[PDB]
């Protein structure tokens, strides 16, 4: 039921700041040229990037390559993940290694600081299916949510 | 067994290429008549350039059956032009004189729309 938010508050034209500091519509030529000028002037640490929660892999790689060609590596995300240790070098360190369908094979599940009912509703539903059919023992470390 | 296929006219590319050249000669000799008969405003040089462009589009084909069909269709196209079954509008549909040049580069296609 969130698709109707794809019909409000949409960005439909490129916009740049005018002499009064407000955003006015412009063309793709003017907006991109104004961005390339600043990008060329700066280099290295002076260029950074942050990725949001709905960005696709195609856009992530393209932005990283563009920022690499000015010798920038500050390609950041909004969702923290500890880099101490192996960091984001081994995929097993930041994946659901058992897989969603693997919960049906588990016999003890330990939940640490997470409300999967709202973060991953269809992952919580899979836990209840094992709880209901496989008599799965579930333990939680965190606030006592239903 | 599997690659055994009944041919149309040619048994190998050498035989097929013979028909292609014969068709090319027939088209080359015909362009002056088409320009005069249809009162086209193009020149004979433009017409013969168009014939060459059409032939060079299908220069990567290596299947004799596919080439025979291309020649069979080409012969039909020549027949419609020689006998004036076509009209001045049909002949001038190879040149696209009314379609504005479509962009070819990424930036030009990026501005107009979403089609790649």
């Amino acid at each position: 039921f969130a698709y109707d938010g794809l019909k409000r508050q949409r960005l439909t034209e490129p916009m740049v700041r005018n002499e009064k500091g407000l955003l006015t519509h412009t063309t793709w030529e003017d907006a991109l040229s104004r961005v390339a000028g600043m990008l060329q002037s700066f280099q290295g640490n002076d260029v950074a990037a942050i990725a949001g929660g709905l960005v696709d892999a195609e856009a992530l790689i393209a932005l990283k390559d563009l920022l690499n060609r000015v010798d920038s590596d500050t390609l950041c995300t909004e969702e923290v993940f500890p880099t101490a240790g192996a960091g984001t070098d081994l995929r097993s360190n930041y994946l659901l290694n058992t897989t969603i369908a693997g919960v049906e094979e588990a016999d003890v599940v330990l939940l640490v600081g997470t409300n999967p009912r709202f973060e991953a509703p269809l992952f919580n539903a899979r836990i209840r299916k094992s709880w209901l059919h496989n008599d799965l023992k579930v333990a939680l470390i965190g606030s006592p949510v239903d | 067994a599997s690659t055994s296929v009944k041919p149309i006219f040619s048994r190998d590319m050498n035989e097929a290429k013979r028909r292609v050249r014969e068709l090319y000669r027939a088209w080359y000799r015909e362009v002056p008549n088409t320009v005069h008969l249809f009162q086209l405003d193009i020149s004979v040089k433009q017409g013969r350039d168009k014939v060459r462009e059409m032939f060079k589009k299908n220069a990567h084909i290596t299947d004799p059956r596919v080439v025979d069909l291309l020649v069979i269709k080409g012969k039909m196209e020549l027949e419609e032009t020689i006998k004036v079954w076509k009209q001045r509008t049909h002949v001038m549909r190879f040149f696209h004189e009314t379609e504005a040049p479509r962009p070819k580069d990424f930036l030009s296609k990026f501005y107009v729309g979403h089609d790649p």
């Binding site: 019909k7 409000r8 949409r10 439909t12 500091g21 407000l22 955003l23 006015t24 | -």
Partner: protein, 48 residues
């Protein structure tokens, strides 16, 4: 109609209009639906 008049209803035209094509009163088509996708309106104040 004099012998068997039509049923009266409040929404029926009381005045009949002949064919209006070619006159200033002619029908002009248009889309009867509202705008589907609303666009974001930038703030009316500076930021820096």
């Amino acid at each position: 109609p004099t012998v068997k008049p039509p049923t009266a209803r409040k929404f029926i035209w009381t005045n009949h209009k002949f064919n209006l094509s070619g006159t200033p009163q002619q029908y002009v088509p248009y889309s009867t639906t509202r705008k589907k996708i609303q666009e974001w309106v930038p703030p009316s104040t500076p930021y820096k």
